[PDB]
């Protein structure tokens, strides 16, 4: 996302506004305003690792844009909107992740490698891999009888189509010591 | 759902795995090792587009 | 299927470690264990 000092009405603010978000969702409701449309209206830009060096990024727009003129104790401890140099804003930080990691529920509440382990295991799980399984003659294929979409889900799953083509089933689980088996 | 982006060869579905390399026509300076006659080098891996 | 079409192989001074530059461009968790760890990146 592009952030410009350029704002007659106040401070340094994100080129993209609430009016654009609604204009996109007009086209989302049909299934005029595409992604290319945001690119050519210059509200968003493509940055390689070289150009990354010369820019300054905001994580959250809202939290990292207006400044302070009480606090919830349960939430994780975040920094500040200190910078007035911000050239760019991050669309969503959860986009640092690739396909497999994006199926991990709360990976931020997990130990660093436990996530790397999951992003290797989900490639050994079962379930519907394609709806055409019956019309194709593959050397080995496993399909789960009754796939269930997860109860705990990532907003990123919407795009991976995981709710449509699952890997598991929501099991009723008890973390207990029983017969010692 | 099937995304494409793959090939069908002699029956099987083939994926061309992205092969990472260092960029060409790039000027780089490196401190060459403690026991060496050369202290620093300016390398340029230059090849036509 | 998706994660296999977003794979990246690195042949052959310390490449296996997660570099600061990889932020936003590569997955910090999706990587194999063992001999390929960090040389097999996922976008």
């Amino acid at each position: 996302f592009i952030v410009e000092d350029d704002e007659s009405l106040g401070h340094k603010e994100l080129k993209v506004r609430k009016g654009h978000i609604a204009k996109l969702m007009a086209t989302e409701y049909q299934d005029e305003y595409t992604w290319s449309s945001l690119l050519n209206e210059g509200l968003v830009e493509y940055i390689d690792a070289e150009e990354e060096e010369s820019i300054l990024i905001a994580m959250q727009p809202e939290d990292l844009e207006p400044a302070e003129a009480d606090v919830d104790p349960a939430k994780r401890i975040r920094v500040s909107h200190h910078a007035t140099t911000f050239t760019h804003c991050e669309i969503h930080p959860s986009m640092i992740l690739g396909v497999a990691a994006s199926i991990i529920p709360f990976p931020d509440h997990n130990q660093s490698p436990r996530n790397t382990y999951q992003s290797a295991m989900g490639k050994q799980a079962m379930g519907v891999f394609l709806t055409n399984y019956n019309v194709r003659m593959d050397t080995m294929a496993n399909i789960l009888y009754y796939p269930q979409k997860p109860l705990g889900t990532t907003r990123a799953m919407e795009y991976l189509k995981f709710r449509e083509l699952p890997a598991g089933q929501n099991a009723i689980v008890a973390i207990a010591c029983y017969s010692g088996y | 759902f099937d995304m494409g982006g793959y090939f069908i060869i002699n029956g099987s579905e083939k994926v061309l795995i992205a092969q990472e390399r260092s960029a060409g026509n790039i000027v780089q300076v490196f401190k060459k090792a403690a026991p060496s006659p050369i202290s620093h080098v300016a390398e340029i891996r230059s090849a036509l587009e | 299927t998706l994660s296999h079409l977003r794979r990246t192989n690195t042949p052959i001074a310390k490449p296996r470690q997660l570099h600061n530059t990889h932020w936003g461009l590569v997955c910090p968790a999706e990587t194999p264990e063992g001999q390929a760890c960090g040389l097999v990146k996922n976008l």
Partner: peptide, 30 residues
């Protein structure tokens, strides 16, 4: 107010429109 600043959930409406045009294997194809 069609120029009111964007919220947190609003970023998903852009991400949605991204894949909508691009798609998850764009790179291999393009």
């Amino acid at each position: 107010d069609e120029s009111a600043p964007i919220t947190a959930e609003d970023s998903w409406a852009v991400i949605s429109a991204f894949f909508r045009e691009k798609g998850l294997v764009s790179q291999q194809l393009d």
